[PDB]
Amino acid sequence: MIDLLQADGNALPSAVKLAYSPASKTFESYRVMTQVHTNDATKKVIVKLADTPQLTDVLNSTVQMPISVSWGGQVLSTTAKEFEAAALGYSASGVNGVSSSQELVISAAPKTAGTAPTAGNYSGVVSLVMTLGSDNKQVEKNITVTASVDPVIELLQADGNALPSAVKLAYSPASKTFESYRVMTQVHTNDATKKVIVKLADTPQLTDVLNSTVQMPISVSWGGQVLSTTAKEFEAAALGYSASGVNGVSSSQELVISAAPKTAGTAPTAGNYSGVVSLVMTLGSDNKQVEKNITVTASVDP
Amino acid sequence: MIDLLQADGNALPSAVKLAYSPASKTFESYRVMTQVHTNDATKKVIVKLADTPQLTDVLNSTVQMPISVSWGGQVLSTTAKEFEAAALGYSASGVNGVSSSQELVISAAPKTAGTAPTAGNYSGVVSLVMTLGSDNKQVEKNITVTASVDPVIELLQADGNALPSAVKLAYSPASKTFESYRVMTQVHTNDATKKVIVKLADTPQLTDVLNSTVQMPISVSWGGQVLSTTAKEFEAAALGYSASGVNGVSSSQELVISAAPKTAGTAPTAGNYSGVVSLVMTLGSDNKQVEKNITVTASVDPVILEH
């Protein structure tokens, strides 16, 4: 009665993966050349979708992306398009009952174009329906459509530049203390509803490069919170993403690195000092983290 | 009694320009090798600044950037540092009171680290003070420091992708219309107080790819407003910049590209159409413009296709 095959003669795939590039933040469309096979090369071919196809987050039902489908140069929907028989330009030369090749295109993207897709595994179906002249001289081809957006987290300077791998704290010889390093930062994330968990991988210390026993503690605060080896969580809501501004980038958070003696009033031993702040930023429950080692130096001059 | 010249023997410049790197968002330091001339090559040289030097925006005095000044390896402040004469390592071999060469580093950075500075012209003075034995006698060398932060404007997709080079408009045979292309865009600028001026460079048409006479008009709207070859102004405050969000970036602005057939109610001629939208965005009163040329395609399919 009616069927739709690859232009080969091969059966259409039951399933289809749409390759994602993190670089361009798009899915590559699935593109196949097809032919209609029929007994009846005189009736209008009526092409529709059985429902509106959606890629849906396989772990979360609120997170959707519209699938687009075209066939024969025509955007398909739940409303049927009719192709005149003569247009599909059937052969009966020696393959009798087979249309010219028509491209099937399966595309996906976010519902608001220009915005990035959420981290996740996505699943849906394209139910393609072809009839002659209505009735049920009918075929349904279902194609499973899956995609994958790998969870991703970056920490950048608020200007988009990489964080310094090396930082120098000035010493005030009057107050006997250090001037704090302060850099404005933003988290760039795929998964903007998840907690951000921030720790230090180890307790940081400035060490006298000539005297292994002369340490002074470093203090690190981020986003207004004093950090340590014990993880502190930041609710996504208290970080200031927007669903209508700079999508998937937090508001500016101040990174603050300082140093002082363990006890106030101590005269810091004259010398050059060094140490490494290891900053760990983890995406809630996505198995993704970013790690920044920052070398911290200082000189104590009398 | 005490003065400071270049290592050559030439006088210090009265003025110095800081080249700004747009890529790294910082300034190329001015570095000059200097020698101290004196009558008393055996004393403490006391080196200090008269004032705290700022680069200040020359059309706005609330926009400031700190100057750093070093000499001999030491960062200088309004508090004086002493240099032991022995340390400056003076000659009297046939130059009778002249130091070993010691480098003057004039630098500046943005007010807040990790933040791009505003487009503008900045001016300040380094008022370098040197003293013999911290007594009655001294020398002031003033160096004017200017820097320029060049205006920049980029138009991007809201996710930070580039705009597409190419756009395909679907045709609906039932309503006899095109489905509009929509994309969310943001303006990135360092000159965030200026008007953004938006026009089309040419009046855009979908033309039949094989016949020039057969054409349909392309409509373009950005940020709610229909674009033409006449420029339209958008006030900076309307575009929803923030002094404390993602700085230098507008709120999202929808670009909408459509086409209508030449006469309403009439099926466009069957065939394949192509044309260019040349979108020009200009920063108000600056030079700096961005142009995005988008190719707009369309396949028309009437009578052949129904409902």
Side-chain angles (χ1 to χ4, degrees), chain B residues 154-230:
Chain B
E154 298 188 315
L155 179 68
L156 296 159
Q157 296 192 39
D159 67 351
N161 293 165
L163 280 196
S165 66
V167 151
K168 212 212 208 152
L169 294 181
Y171 176 78
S172 166
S175 56
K176 306 189 225 209
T177 35
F178 296 83
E179 161 68 47
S180 309
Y181 175 81
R182 285 179 227 267
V183 69
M184 290 310 219
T185 72
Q186 306 192 290
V187 17
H188 293 237
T189 191
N190 61 357
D191 210 356
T193 51
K194 301 297 187 85
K195 285 123 134 163
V196 173
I197 297 164
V198 189
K199 74 190 180 118
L200 317 163
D202 302 292
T203 295
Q205 297 290 328
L206 290 177
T207 302
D208 194 355
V209 131
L210 294 163
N211 185 307
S212 74
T213 75
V214 178
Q215 49 201 159
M216 304 175 279
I218 291 165
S219 47
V220 195
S221 98
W222 189 79
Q225 305 308 147
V226 168
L227 306 179
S228 52
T229 45
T230 306

Side-chain angles (χ1 to χ4, degrees), chain B residues 39-88:
Chain B
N39 73 304
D40 193 64
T42 185
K43 52 75 220 71
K44 47 177 204 148
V45 190
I46 280 97
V47 187
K48 62 153 219 196
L49 301 172
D51 296 80
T52 299
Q54 303 300 288
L55 292 182
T56 287
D57 202 310
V58 86
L59 295 147
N60 197 20
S61 36
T62 6
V63 184
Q64 304 213 309
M65 294 189 283
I67 288 151
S68 296
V69 172
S70 30
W71 198 93
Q74 299 304 285
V75 180
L76 309 170
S77 49
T78 54
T79 301
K81 293 197 197 159
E82 68 184 271
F83 282 89
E84 324 263 79
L88 290 110

Side-chain angles (χ1 to χ4, degrees), chain B residues 264-277:
Chain B
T266 294
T269 315
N272 296 311
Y273 292 82
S274 163
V276 188
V277 175

Side-chain angles (χ1 to χ4, degrees), chain A residues 17 56-60 118-123 146-151:
Chain A
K17 244 274 181 93
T56 295
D57 197 299
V58 109
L59 287 165
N60 184 346
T118 307
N121 283 282
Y122 289 86
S123 186
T146 69
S148 295
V149 186
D150 286 353

Side-chain angles (χ1 to χ4, degrees), chain A residues 79-137:
Chain A
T79 315
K81 286 185 165 164
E82 329 169 345
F83 288 71
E84 311 268 68
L88 289 154
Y90 282 105
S91 62
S93 195
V95 288
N96 53 354
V98 183
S99 76
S100 69
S101 300
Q102 302 296 142
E103 197 191 350
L104 185 76
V105 196
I106 297 156
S107 56
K111 192 184 118 180
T112 45
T115 61
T118 307
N121 283 282
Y122 289 86
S123 186
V125 232
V126 173
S127 322
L128 215 83
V129 180
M130 289 206 174
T131 348
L132 308 166
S134 189
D135 296 279
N136 313 112
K137 220 149 184 163

